[PDB]
Structure 1
Amino acid sequence: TFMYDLVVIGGGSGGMAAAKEAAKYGKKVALFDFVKPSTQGTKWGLGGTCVNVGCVPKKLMHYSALIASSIHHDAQMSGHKTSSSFEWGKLVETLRNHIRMLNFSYRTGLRVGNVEYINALAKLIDPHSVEYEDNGQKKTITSRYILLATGGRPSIPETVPGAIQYSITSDDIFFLSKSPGKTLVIGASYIGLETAGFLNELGFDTTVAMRSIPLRGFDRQCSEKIVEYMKATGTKFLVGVVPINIEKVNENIKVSFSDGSVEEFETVLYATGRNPDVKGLNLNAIGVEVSDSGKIIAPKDATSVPSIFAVGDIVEGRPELTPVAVKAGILLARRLFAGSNEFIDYDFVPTTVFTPIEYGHVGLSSEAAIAKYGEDDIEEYLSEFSTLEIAAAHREKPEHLRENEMDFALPLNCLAKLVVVKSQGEKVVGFHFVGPNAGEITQGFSLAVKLGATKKDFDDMIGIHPTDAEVFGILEVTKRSGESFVSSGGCGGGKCG
């Protein structure tokens, strides 16, 4: 009856994962991926946003930034007097070489996994039919099931003159042929703070235009600590201010702001948000229902058309993360072809923001815990402190950023916080860690929290010394107490005695 069991539109995190899992059950699977060029003409190989213009290149640029920070702050104190100069084009070559190998690895992975990969834009014709172009000619294939996994693309405001013509996005930043120099980042999203963070660490003059608050939706205390640290290390923030006009003035971009100020930059990067890439799919003619944001309505991965499914960044009401796209794709394949009833538990989706000091969490912010349980049923335990290694190095604020002689130190690099429900025996409902290696620390704690750990389980946990992570075994200061949660000790996360 159908040429295929499953046709996947999109060769990113969710699409590649669903397609390969489906083919393991002996099913006939096709996958389409084609990269429409960015607003500045950037394009790239198979594997989607994470592989090409997301998690992978972002993590490599952050690693370069952490090396720059250790050479500047730490190396001499560790006995390694080091002079260095940064070559943007060399970091870009390293990123491009690594991503080019991943492109080929994913191409081979689909073929070996018995998935037919077609490098073409696909569009829906009917609930069982997909159209694409091959060598001039439009062809149709039929499938029992169709998965939409086309992800998102950066948003640039149409209502700001010159924004679309002169600005770059995350689609362009990792591959720029020339260093960005003096840079404006618009948006205090995780993408904007990560990007501003690594550009400032690499030595670029960096400004963030923040419409309101940093990391809207994340814990306020952790979000503000990140901004405090970024400011102390040289990122400038324009608070409550957005570009209204962008023009080329000689070799620079002249930006006019919503408060009447004007400033020239070499690079202007929009990191405001991402829109789901669905306008080309012909959703309205097929009867696939979309929300007011343009995302697909598919709370259990099933669209309004029962033969059409969706996972990843295009689906309303789920976090835009690689592991959530991957796991949704795999579990969908198992429900379709292996009689699984398994769904992701969306209450336990940990995440990490790779800012100059990183931020990992799972469960509820202080604000969401207070909203759900009430202030009286919540205890917040916290400690702000320095990594042992970093404390010994005596990191100092750049001279130009000091308010006075007293303002010499960087802020403490770590904040550990547990959010607990008193009526459930101080069950942990929120875990928060700001500091180095925050993703590495949060991963295992996120499983402990998912399994129902209480404050008592944390207090009875034997520490690994010396680590930052061991701090979670010895939290005692509460927000309610109003006592100082600052530790000026030098043994790091843990107690030497």
Structure 2
Amino acid sequence: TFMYDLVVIGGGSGGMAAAKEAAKYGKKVALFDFVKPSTQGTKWGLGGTCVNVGCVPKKLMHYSALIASSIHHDAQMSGHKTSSSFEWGKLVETLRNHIRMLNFSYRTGLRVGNVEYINALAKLIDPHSVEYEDNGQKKTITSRYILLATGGRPSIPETVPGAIQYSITSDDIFFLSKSPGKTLVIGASYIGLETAGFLNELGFDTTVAMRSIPLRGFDRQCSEKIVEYMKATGTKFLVGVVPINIEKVNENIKVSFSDGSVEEFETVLYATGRNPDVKGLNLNAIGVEVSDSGKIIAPKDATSVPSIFAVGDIVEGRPELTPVAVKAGILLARRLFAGSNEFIDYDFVPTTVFTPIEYGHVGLSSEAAIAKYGEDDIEEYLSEFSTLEIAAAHREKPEHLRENEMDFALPLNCLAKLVVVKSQGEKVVGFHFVGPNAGEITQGFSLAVKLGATKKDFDDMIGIHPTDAEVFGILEVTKRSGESFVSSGGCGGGK
């Protein structure tokens, strides 16, 4: 008795997934998506945050970093003699051209999967209605179900003066027509670390402002190695120190600090966090119960209004990740229309940080596993080592960080770790890898864990040689045994 079966307010990963899956069932779908311009005026097309100002551009930026390293460390050692200069402006061009492809690419995929895209803001009018603008004339449509999927945007703190007026965000940094030069990043979140990662690797004086600890939430050992690697590679780290003032001194940005120090940067980037973009939705009036944290309350993807659902960055007590959006979004479209009652096993969500060395994992940090099971049912088997090709390169620290005459070597680029449970035959509850291609490595092993692997199964695993992944077949050292888990020997993670 409603104009539609399903309306979706948000053209993001979660958004477009639910829409297309819902449409695979002859069910009639509207989708809204409009890009409110950033605090610095930046704006873009269809696909959401992952296509535009997220995972897609990110990785191309990381890739162009990973390249630049090999060039500087590896190219000659592998017998390739090289000049190379870098133009920000062209890297941008490659991003915008590929992203443009995807914006278009996606519009089409919605049309072809038979979904009515409308480029316009939506605003909840009641349990089954929404309001938008059309030619600047406000029209209203009605649905059996509605999906909120609006994503978030960056939080620039309003108590630090000269932030909003000047500082850029994640939404602007892939597409600066201007190389950002000497750059302060405020954040030791996955984004900040990643973003201060490629600026450095791409040869820009990069400082990082860490209020306390790096990557709050993730496993401590693994995060402490990442920071150690990034210091070694020319990223500087002001811990316990945030900005308290930001001002324009000529064509530079002077940045007063909490400890009582000052510094000038050509570009400043607040990576401090994100707030769900739910303010224009008009929630509370409809009756959508939202947390103290602004995030919406809907842990089975269903709000306080049961004709209304939510997914992705906006819903509380779930990771903010693209595939987590998608699975939930697909399922919700199945559960409703195609007789299903599957929900995501949240106990098993892999992720990977693409820091200059990548960190992947599934399940519990050593810390979280020590709590749930106590430091007696907990055994930490690990091996820290160099991947063969990089062992051969003899990668060195930049001069300005040398302390002695045999100080040349970067840290070993890998660390593998399984955390397992004495009282469940050493059942595996934590899988963690710091290295190149951590995600490519993390993936296969996420499913073995989720199929209930033990250390027994791991050691009966036969290696692929040479790989860094094979180290998992021969972890024997332990935290409890206290002895050396280092492996200088360039045999690798197996023989």
Deviations 1:345-373 (A, max 9, x none): 00000000000000000000000000100
Q: CA deviation at 1:492?
A: 1.7
Deviations 1:274-333 (A, max 9, x none): 100000000011010100110000000000000010000000000000000011000000
Q: Secondary structure at the match of 2:444?
A: helix
Q: CA deviation at 1:402?
A: 1.2
| CA–CA separation in structure 2 for the residues paired with 1:83 and 1:376 | 55
Deviations 1:475-494 (A, max 9, x none): 00000000000001112221
| CA–CA separation in structure 2 for the residues paired with 1:371 and 1:189 | 23
| CA–CA separation in structure 2 for the residues paired with 1:403 and 1:56 | 39
Instruction: State yes or no: 1:309 paired with 2:328.
Output: no
| CA–CA separation in structure 2 for the residues paired with 1:122 and 1:245 | 37
Residue number in structure 2 paired with 1:28: 28
Q: CA deviation at 1:208?
A: 0.3
Q: CA deviation at 1:343?
A: 0.3
Q: Secondary structure at the match of 2:285?
A: helix
Q: CA deviation at 1:256?
A: 0.5
Instruction: State yes or no: 1:155 paired with 2:146.
Output: no
Q: CA deviation at 1:49?
A: 0.4
Q: Secondary structure at the match of 1:223?
A: helix
Q: CA deviation at 1:27?
A: 0.5
| CA–CA separation in structure 2 for the residues paired with 1:276 and 1:412 | 39
Q: CA deviation at 1:473?
A: 0.2
Deviations 1:114-150 (A, max 9, x none): 1000000000001100000010100000001000000
TM-score, normalization: structure 1? 0.99
| CA–CA separation in structure 2 for the residues paired with 1:177 and 1:134 | 33
Q: Secondary structure at the match of 1:141?
A: strand
Deviations 1:23-70 (A, max 9, x none): 111001000000000000000010000010000000000000000000
Number of positions where the alignment pairs a residue of Structure 1 with one of Structure 2: 495
| CA–CA separation in structure 2 for the residues paired with 1:257 and 1:127 | 48
| CA–CA separation in structure 1 for the residues paired with 2:493 and 2:74 | 19
| CA–CA separation in structure 1 for the residues paired with 2:105 and 2:143 | 27
Any stretches of 5+ residues in structure 1 without a counterpart? none
Instruction: State yes or no: 1:39 paired with 2:35.
Output: no
Q: CA deviation at 1:406?
A: 2.7
Residue number in structure 2 paired with 1:443: 443
| CA–CA separation in structure 2 for the residues paired with 1:494 and 1:183 | 40
Q: CA deviation at 1:89?
A: 0.4
Instruction: State yes or no: 1:180 paired with 2:180.
Output: yes
Q: Secondary structure at the match of 2:84?
A: strand
| CA–CA separation in structure 1 for the residues paired with 2:247 and 2:111 | 47
Q: CA deviation at 1:83?
A: 1.1
| CA–CA separation in structure 1 for the residues paired with 2:84 and 2:439 | 28
Q: CA deviation at 1:403?
A: 1.9
Q: Secondary structure at the match of 1:288?
A: coil
Q: CA deviation at 1:375?
A: 0.3
| CA–CA separation in structure 2 for the residues paired with 1:450 and 1:83 | 47
Deviations 1:360-403 (A, max 9, x none): 00000000000100000000000000000000000000001112
| CA–CA separation in structure 2 for the residues paired with 1:281 and 1:339 | 30
| CA–CA separation in structure 2 for the residues paired with 1:258 and 1:246 | 12
Q: CA deviation at 1:404?
A: 2.0
| CA–CA separation in structure 2 for the residues paired with 1:176 and 1:486 | 42
Instruction: State yes or no: 1:85 paired with 2:85.
Output: yes
Residue number in structure 2 paired with 1:205: 205
Q: Secondary structure at the match of 1:163?
A: coil
Q: CA deviation at 1:407?
A: 1.7
Deviations 1:84-104 (A, max 9, x none): 100000000001111000001
TM-score, normalization: structure 2? 1.00
Q: CA deviation at 1:417?
A: 0.2
| CA–CA separation in structure 2 for the residues paired with 1:70 and 1:453 | 36
User: Deviating runs (4+, > 4 A) in structure 1?
Assistant: none
Residue number in structure 2 paired with 1:488: 488
How much identity, in percent, do the aligned residues show? 100
| CA–CA separation in structure 1 for the residues paired with 2:126 and 2:186 | 40
| CA–CA separation in structure 2 for the residues paired with 1:410 and 1:57 | 28
Provide the alpha-carbon RMSD of the alignment.
Answer: 0.5
| CA–CA separation in structure 1 for the residues paired with 2:230 and 2:57 | 21
| CA–CA separation in structure 1 for the residues paired with 2:390 and 2:290 | 49
Deviations 1:444-472 (A, max 9, x none): 00000000000010000000000000000
Deviations 1:180-201 (A, max 9, x none): 0000000000000000001000
Q: Secondary structure at the match of 2:165?
A: helix
| CA–CA separation in structure 2 for the residues paired with 1:405 and 1:8 | 62
